[PDB]
Design a protein around this ligand. Structure first.
Ligand SMILES: [Cu+2]
Length: 128
């Protein structure tokens, strides 16, 4: 949509897109994560996290390492640019971020930090 994307995380851990293109015109960008299916947060929770492609592994490891209670995102982790909370089936959440935080020509990956989910739930964000 205009400066927004509606992305989904389903019970067979996949995202409904794998490519997000944020236009330079947008001053803010909004992602609305929604979760269809019936499998609950502790078994198939999802979240939308944004970092540079280089930082990704690290955010994922230190988030995995931090636990359900901390929604698998290490607290005040400087590498995560924007993130939603972890949601189970039937939940929704959105995050708007400053597009001026995205550097032109850098590689940004979006992903889900919940254990084992990044292997299929992750894609690219490109700021044109
Ligand atoms: Cu996930």
């Amino acid at each position: 949509a205009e400066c927004s994307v509606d992305i989904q995380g389903n019970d067979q851990m996949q995202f409904n897109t794998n490519a997000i293109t944020v236009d330079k015109s947008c001053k803010q960008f909004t992602v609305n994560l929604s979760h269809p299916g019936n499998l609950p947060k502790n078994v198939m929770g999802h979240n939308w996290v944004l970092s540079t492609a280089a930082d990704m592994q690290g955010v994922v490891t230190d988030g995995m390492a931090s636990g359900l209670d901390k929604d698998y995102l290490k607290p005040d982790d400087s590498r995560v640019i924007a993130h939603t909370k972890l949601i189970g089936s039937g939940e929704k959440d959105s995050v708007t971020f400053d597009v001026s935080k995205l550097k032109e020509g850098e590689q940004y990956m979006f992903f889900c930090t919940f254990p084992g989910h990044s292997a299929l739930e992750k894609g690219t964000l490109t700021l044109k």
